[PDB]
Amino acid sequence: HWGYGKHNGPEHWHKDFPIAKGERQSPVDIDTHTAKYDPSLKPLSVSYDQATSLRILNNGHAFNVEFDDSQDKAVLKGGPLDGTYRLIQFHFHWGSLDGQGSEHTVDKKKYAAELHLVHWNTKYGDFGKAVQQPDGLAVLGIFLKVGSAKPGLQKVVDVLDSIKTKGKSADFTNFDPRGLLPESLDYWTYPGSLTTPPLLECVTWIVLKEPISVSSEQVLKFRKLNFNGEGEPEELMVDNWRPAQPLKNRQIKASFK
Template identity: 60%
Template sequence: RYLYCYWGGVLKRAIPVTINGNAAATAEIFHSVHAGPDKWADNFPIANGPRQSPIDIAPDASSYDAALKPLRLKYDPSTCLEILNNGHSFQVTFADDTDSSTLKDGPVSGIYRLKQFHFHWGASDDKGSEHTVNGTKYPAELHLVHWNTKYASFGEAASKPDGLAVVGVFLEIGGANASLQEVLNTFSAIKAKGKQTSFADFDPSTLLPACLDYWTYDGSLTTPPLLESVTWIVCKEPISVSREQMKKFRELLFSAEGEAECCMVDNYRPPQPLKGRSVRASFKK
């Protein structure tokens, strides 16, 4: 037998699999094969909704909005808790019971607390980002996920039109990124789906570009349940990552221990139709 690992309808690799009668494991493998973005609308009709993400950003079609404020990001390294492999990315989680790590201003009003950050990346350096700029793909994209404290919890906020604010940062090939390397150094402990380890005292602001000019639009989560609750803030300036560092991303696995190994690559959703939405820029062209 051969197991084909898909994400976004793209064949990742064919792996010999011995089916040993473990129905649960087989079902999990089968689900992973058939649950790429092209299938999501079957179970999540909002996949075809009016404000889906990501999008292709066309800078010439975006409008400068002088009313947009600079981003105010205040992150406390002591709120960083752990890093885990959730089977579709790796995620660094933060304590969010106080206003210690927050996003303010930019296109949003109120206080948004940092919940987690994660990445999307490709099987090669010519693709991997979820958002694109004039069709240009980056090898990876960082998402810092925040929730609006006017709601009682992340879970409640995630279902509200103004519930979440996600800062997106592109990665481009260049010099090695020392801050990113701190994250990559944990990967041996979280290689397989479901693995996690403590990850303390990390300052995510060290992963931000020096210039925080941004585009913003109303969008959604880019993985199921695809809720249309996200104010997207996509930074114009990328951060650097070396080719060797990108190779480390691809050593993670979609699969759990005991399953046929399936490398975690191409875990991005393709750009979705704009459907009349406006994209605003915090900077002049």
């Protein structure tokens, strides 16, 4: 099935998932001089003080940190959003080299990695119903550049040895995602999709302007994960990013001048 190799990567996905050539696919290049400042956009409200992390999973495409989303514990509101969106998981996309790895680009710049904090619109009752709706999800995207270490990321880095291969999971309680946020919540926003199959067009993307800095050693440890399962030939989990897709009839809005 689908992956990031030459025979099953992004250029092949449309054969099983024809929406790959759809009208609101993600990621996109953010042309900063074409995005319009929208003074009607509100500040983001990121309320993660009560977040309850549960588990970390290597799903063969990335590693996902999963949260308890059975109550309004960690929520995203405001910005372009109507209503309340509940945090369900986060994961990253990254490169084989520091020069690439992000999915979104900024004036064609590729960052070393990109963090996706995935939230679902509570009006639909659960995640499975939400992904069926054009306003079902809000994904907060945060760029990573290589520089100083991110202290709040280290607990993630240090558990990766225990989920090296596809299908492995580990307990991952009491992780505070506030330690992954930059100082500023200035953002760009546009309507898009999941960036892997099934590529559903159900996402309000909110991409922060300010990257976070992680150390070379931190991102090097991401690159030791495996796409394969245990007992299969080793294929390093690197370059698990989809390139920019056509913007088509969409406008990217900026929260900031």
